[PDB]
Symmetry: D2
Subunit: 262 residues, 4 copies
């Protein structure tokens, strides 16, 4: 009988962003000092890029097949995703495919992504507030950039907006690909006549979307579009995995998944 933990993120090949994930690995090791920890990545293109750099970057299926070969029997897979969207659901299907395979893993549990229950959503709103830069002043809006998805779990973003507004009317959620859109965010900012606006990723790592769509020099970045509107945009290139308060939520989900192995 041999327990293991498999941490699974979307992943990033951005050098400057990868430390957020290393930090999570430290937290997990610190919380569970006697349980081996393994990594996988859900984005096929990030795995390609990492392999190109000479770095092992297993898919969840490669990682679980390898852990079965090492003789693990019970594995808690922790999603480092923000919402229970397409990546998370693919992860559940994969995990459950491995469970019970002849001579393989006995039990594979899966920890919820960040915005799990409405209780989690409320905890995330509280944690995001705790994570805000000390230099942000009262009344300066903060826009959290979620990925957005066509999947039904996109509803987690307007859901989170509800909880954030019960803390501070000037905290806003926008997404690259889903709802609310950045145009919705700009309309929110116009009604507030805000002159300085902070932008923080609502992704575990500050990857390509944070560096390019949120804060890029390109004309269509959020920071470029705000500057054209006469707003001083203040992008913060830190993923949510950098925050202890936000990280605690994934850590509790991992505790829950570990308990489900028993």
């Amino acid at each position: 009988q041999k327990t293991g933990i498999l941490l699974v993120a979307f992943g990033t090949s951005v050098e400057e962003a990868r430390p957020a994930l290393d930090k999570m690995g430290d937290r997990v090791r610190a919380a569970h000092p006697d349980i081996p920890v393994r990594w996988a990545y859900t984005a096929k293109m990030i795995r390609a890029k990492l392999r190109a750099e000479g770095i092992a970057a297993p898919s969840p299926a490669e990682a679980l097949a390898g852990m079965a070969e090492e003789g693990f029997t019970h594995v808690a897979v922790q999603s480092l995703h923000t919402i229970p969207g397409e990546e998370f659901h693919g992860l559940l299907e994969t995990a459950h495919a491995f469970q019970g395979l002849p001579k393989g893993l006995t039990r594979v549990s899966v920890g919820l992504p960040l915005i799990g229950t409405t209780a989690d959503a409320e905890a995330v709103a509280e944690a995001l507030v705790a994570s805000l830069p000390a230099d942000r002043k009262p009344g300066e809006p903060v826009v959290f950039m979620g990925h957005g998805t066509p999947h039904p779990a996109d509803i987690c973003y307007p859901g989170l907006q509800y909880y954030l507004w019960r803390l501070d009317p000037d905290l806003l959620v926008g997404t690259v690909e889903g709802s609310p859109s950045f145009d919705n965010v700009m309309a929110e900012l116009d009604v507030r006549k805000a002159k300085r606006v902070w932008l923080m990723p609502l992704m575990a790592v500050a990857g390509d979307h944070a560096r390019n769509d949120m804060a890029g020099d390109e004309d269509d970045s959020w920071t470029s579009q705000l500057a054209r509107r006469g707003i001083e945009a203040k992008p913060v290139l830190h993923g949510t995995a950098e925050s202890d308060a936000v990280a605690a939520i994934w850590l509790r989900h991992l505790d829950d998944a570990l308990a489900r192995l028993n």
Copy 2:
């Protein structure tokens, strides 16, 4: 090759509430005049009560097993649930269990519940507004009573609240068992100092929760608690399946599920 449709609701044994579901059956027949329509119910206690009254009330598993015996080969199962919560997810698992069974159904698709994508959520908010009683005046709040759940899909309720507020600041979502709670709703009403408040179910049928928790004579009903606060509460005992605008959304989800059989 033989196509069928299986309509699946939570269900109700309340005589006065069941017509909402009959209405849905009419709409579906009208839209798909050549495809047999069958019914099932996800709540084990409602099936027990209906059987007690001498009424057939198959589980999704009983219904699909019976349709396989009739020689259906491709069945679109339409969820008449509001959110993709525990009932919906149980329905997907069941549907997919039947698909491909030796000598049974070839393909079983499942239509999304009402609050599917963020696009659906936005359409639901628009449809709820279209459904409001003509006697409700501008500025009188309306509280939509969702069921609420411990499942992650509870986030659909604060999500819907976001879309409703982009239409009218005085439209509110509360739930019996999840978030937002009715205490959250009362705090919303207190800030608005509202003197007349409408209450509408955010369930397909106006069942036990609408008749007892929302509008009961008992002390803890929403209407009783509002009356104690000096508010004229105006409960509307109509499920969302009574609305043509709301029903259209489930009908489009059924179209989508039918298309997925091909």
Copy 3:
């Protein structure tokens, strides 16, 4: 927690043959007096015929869906099939589809058909010998009519032939649809120059194949073809479920399946 047994046969709509299955139901009740026993049938055409006669004849899927509705939690499904062929394999898939369904059965085990392990095959050969009519004389061949199948489990028939020959060189296996064929059986009989030959079904019940293909008045029956060869054919219209010795083997498989629920 509620245990049930589901007995599953190919089935028959032949009035005179059905008592063999009733006998099995008695044996099972006698062995497991406190466990409810339910029936299903794997042949879609037999279920059609039985329903036509006004008799309930559930498919395995209908039966299990109904047992879930009665609140059974652990069900041992016993195959009353002779080989682990297509019907048995369809039964396993169905059983396993029901296991773990939300709010349904917790555990569904499946008992092996008659010719399970090589130890079972050897026990079957011994039991068939014990079942022979007292009037059959030493040296008179006995031909056991198996169904035969295109499935790989057809190999159970030549397998059983091996074990039967270690008991008596004049015991022969033939099949309607697989190998050995009846032409192979006739060649076996020609080398033996046998003048009187017994024919016994190697099916649980003496159904259509026993009454028509093995013993029919039609020209192509086994008894007709033997009579044309000058052989006195002595058909015995008793299914193997009539034999206590043969029945014990299915009963042990049911014990094994019951044990697997724990």
Copy 4:
């Protein structure tokens, strides 16, 4: 859309035995010159030994996870097993676990092991005869050593014995772990009073069982036990994959599996 073939054997770490599997790889390449061929092994201990020698030896799960990462979409998995026993069944479950995984393989078919249908069993008996050493004389028995298993598919061995005896009364099947046993084989040889007896593996490769249990210097080997009985034992250390006639059967099963991808 990208087709691949995955050849899966029990495997061997015996240097002298591995060429039989290389031969199969050549045959497959020759038959399907444009389709990439990959290898996996079902025995966990053989994979351990091969890894110890610095050789990649993926499990079926490792191999399929890697092929998904290479962007294969349709993979025909060919079993190089002799019977549809526990290894084969584990292989089917694994193959089917990978099929349809999000962003992974679309279709994974599995080719039957050697003794598939009764038609295959008859073809195997014919192929074994074609494979016999030219020096074996008429009337000298040949004993084929199968592995044997507790699984129901052990019945394939007495089944094959039936077909072999329709070709030559002196061809015998024994197994290490199942039925018929080697003691059964010795009793067959005693009735024949045979003075010279050939021993051939009924495994794809002449691995540990062929080299040690069938032909070892140890007292309990088949060749040692025969020599004690005054029989000249003539072991042939060639696996069945060395035979063109036997190999053709696995090749047809691979054709069938390739066709099932369409």
